[PDB]
């Protein structure tokens, strides 16, 4: 997260770290058994680490749980990173407590101008902000006009832009799969951009509100 601040510990209790030897993507807990992340973060087995604030230190709040199933959206397209959403089923349920709580799925799509929070352990591009401690950033959803103007003809219905066209504040490598939460609902999943925090290149996010049918049917398919 570039241009953000260290989150109050456990203020984002749905945030998880996906780990296969090192942190490489984030995710969000949506109930005891399932995590939402980005399809390009797919690995056949991942360890999900919950209740984290500083990922390089054991703090006593953590739960490390192996995945039993990792399910990409059937229509994910790696060429253009379209339908970039994935479900991860935990091999055992998470214990919900002060450190670990699920985030609600969206009741409807959030309109442009809504202020949201994005968080993660990715690159901060700063000697002052430590990426091992969870970073937080408040970003507004941008209009489709602004989003398509920044990335001509690259924005599909499964995508939205959020951030600041002036640059300086953005998500970045290592934040993929993590949450964009707006008024208590998961509206986006960190997905792609050109560089990080560059002027005219805001972050692009998977649009969770058009996937509620696939997410809720798959979370009860097996």
């Amino acid at each position: 997260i570039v241009g953000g601040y260290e989150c109050k510990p456990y203020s984002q209790p749905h945030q998880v770290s996906l780990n296969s030897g090192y942190h490489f993507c984030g995710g969000s807990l949506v109930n005891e058994n399932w995590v939402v992340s980005a399809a390009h973060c797919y690995k056949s087995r991942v360890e999900v680490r919950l209740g984290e604030h500083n990922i390089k230190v054991t703090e006593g709040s953590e739960q490390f749980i192996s995945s039993s199933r990792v399910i990409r959206h059937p229509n994910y397209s790696s060429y253009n990173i379209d339908n970039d959403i994935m479900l991860i089923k935990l091999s055992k349920p998470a214990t919900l407590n002060t450190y670990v709580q699920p985030v609600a799925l969206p009741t409807s799509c959030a309109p442009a101008g809504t202020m949201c929070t994005v968080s993660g352990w990715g690159n901060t591009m700063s000697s002052t902000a430590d990426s091992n401690k969870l970073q937080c950033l408040n970003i507004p959803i941008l209009s489709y006009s602004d989003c398509n103007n920044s990335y001509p003809g690259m924005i599909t219905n499964a995508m939205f832009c959020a951030g600041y066209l002036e640059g300086g504040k953005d998500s970045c490598q290592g934040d993929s799969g993590g949450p964009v939460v707006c008024n208590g609902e998961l509206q986006g999943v960190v997905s792609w951009g050109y560089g990080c925090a560059e002027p005219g290149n805001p972050g692009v996010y998977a649009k969770v509100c058009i996937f509620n049918d696939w997410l809720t049917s798959t979370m009860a398919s097996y």
Binding site: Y22, H23, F24, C25, A38, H40, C41, S78, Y79, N80, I81, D84, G122, N123, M154, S171, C172, Q173, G174, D175, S176, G177, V190, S191, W192, G193, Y194, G195, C196, G203
Partner: peptide, 29 residues
């Protein structure tokens, strides 16, 4: 260029996804 925000170690550009390149620091971006 279109570059997903995953943390991925690399040596050369071809190790990276989409239009990400392997930046000097040994990671895609």
């Amino acid at each position: 260029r279109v570059c997903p925000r995953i943390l991925m170690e690399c040596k050369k550009d071809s190790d990276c996804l989409a239009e990400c390149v392997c930046l000097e620091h040994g990671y895609c971006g």
